[PDB]
Design a binder for this molecule. Sequence first.
Ligand SMILES: [Zn+2]
Ligand SMILES: [Zn+2]
Ligand SMILES: [Zn+2]
Ligand SMILES: [Zn+2]
Lengths: 151, 111, 355
Amino acid sequence: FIKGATISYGKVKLVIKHNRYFVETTQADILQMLLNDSVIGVHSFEIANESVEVVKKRCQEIDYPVLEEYDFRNDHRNPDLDIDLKPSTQIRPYQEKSLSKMFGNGRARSGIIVLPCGAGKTLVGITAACTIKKSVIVLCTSSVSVMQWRQ
Amino acid sequence: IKPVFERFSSVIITSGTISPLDMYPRMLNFKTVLQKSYAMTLAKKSFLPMIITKGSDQVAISSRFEIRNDPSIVRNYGSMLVEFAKITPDGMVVFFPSYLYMESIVSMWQT
Amino acid sequence: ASLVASIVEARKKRTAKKNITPYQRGIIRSLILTLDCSEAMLEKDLRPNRHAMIIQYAIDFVHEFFDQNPISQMGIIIMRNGLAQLVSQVSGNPQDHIDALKSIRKQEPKGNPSLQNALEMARGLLLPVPAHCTREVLIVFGSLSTTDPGDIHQTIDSLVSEKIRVKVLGLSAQVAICKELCKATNYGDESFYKILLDETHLKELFNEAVTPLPVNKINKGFTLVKMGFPTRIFEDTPTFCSCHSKLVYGGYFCPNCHSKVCSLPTVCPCCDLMLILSTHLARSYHHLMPLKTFAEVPTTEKFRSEDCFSCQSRFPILTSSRYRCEDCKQEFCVDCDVFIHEILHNCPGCESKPV
Ligand SMILES: [Zn+2]
Ligand SMILES: [Zn+2]
Ligand SMILES: [Zn+2]
Ligand SMILES: [Zn+2]
């Protein structure tokens, strides 16, 4: 089961070249497996950018998963937002481990983090933004709450 | 110290914590016929040196003449002061590079 | 290497205990137990409380001292909130000290120490003490500071003039004033000021501190004491005691005034003489002649017997646990040797050895 849980990691990569999803691969070797699947439509090509959501599912069944690990420092094109914090804030070690989760390589691994209520999840997100240091937006389906996270 | 050198041949120089030795024949135009250093062959260690680069809050600490009036690092410094004040049996001394800065920090500390 | 480490730690303990000497030690003792209800002993670094294990270990020390030194009398001074207090003076009755101890257990400890006040009224408590009655005070302290109404050094010199030896047991670490106290109190010796490291070492300090202390030639007190045993009479009537005036079925007679008392070892209340039994004097002959340590023979030699001379169990081989009494030349096991040295007061191998 662990042996069959071996993926083509680092082998499919979507890059957003200024709101343009270019689905690169690390090699032409991935392309010969990928062309066997025909739902779609080093080497990138045209994909309907809404259909990326469904073909991520489709490549999960055909077991070549894409990774999202942002080289923000190598993406000089997007303007950086160099914003720091105060030394008076104290990061708890589980929040430090959570920051180590997407920064095993330093590239921004995209994913899910769920924490208990009142755990300073706002402060963890503020720390994550202050170490990402790029253009960034915050979303939540309410108003009173959204203005108090702004505060 | 030149007329001391040409007045006396047996000029013998020693100190406690003079380390290293080589810049002293640079700053003073002289040489020694021999020079070395000595460390004690103590049984077990009874002086305990360690370098603290951070408080218990893990905040980097310094006493530079620009960032000397940084109240967060000041609060860290007094957390250290509290924790040694709670545990000091007999005597304890703190030094700083500059007496005006001492008076400034102790003034706001008393405040 | 576990047995090797045990052997070398037993060697270090044996080097500490090599001075087995028949010193004349303090037998007629008068004790003051200085205790503190200060806010430093409220700290929950000790579980459940510093004051908690102070209460239980003090109860244990009260029992151990009344057993090992029954003829002595011991007093209790409590420090609490800037002025020390007295809850138990020197008595042959442990029950009063135990009731005061559990009263302190029921109450809360809080305050700040005044060691000069504690020493001054301890001095006044030891003021009507006879010369043969040795004056000793035990000190516990959970802090690093003490404000005092006047200077301590005149008190120090005055208590040195009152011929007192005092042990001090601190909580955190060594304090220079208490070190100087034990120094000047104990003729330059500073083995009397010891600090614990945990509760096991703390209990070991208690078990050491129950024992009497050897006395010097220079503070000579060579005299006689006018002693007399009472006579127990199992009487057939409820009869008044001299002290508490209550009707008791049986009891003792005074050797002179024929009055009865509730308990032993106590002085007479009427003709005012110390009334003990042979048990109380019998309690310290193992102090009067000690038991020297036993020669742990090595496994290289051939042995006279390969089983224990006393408990009759076979000896093991890597190391040789055959421990030979030099007064008897019979090897014993480690279990029997430790038990005999901790409890027994005669070598049955020396009973086997004819003189
Ligand atoms: Zn009575
Ligand atoms: Zn009588
Ligand atoms: Zn045995
Ligand atoms: Zn023997």
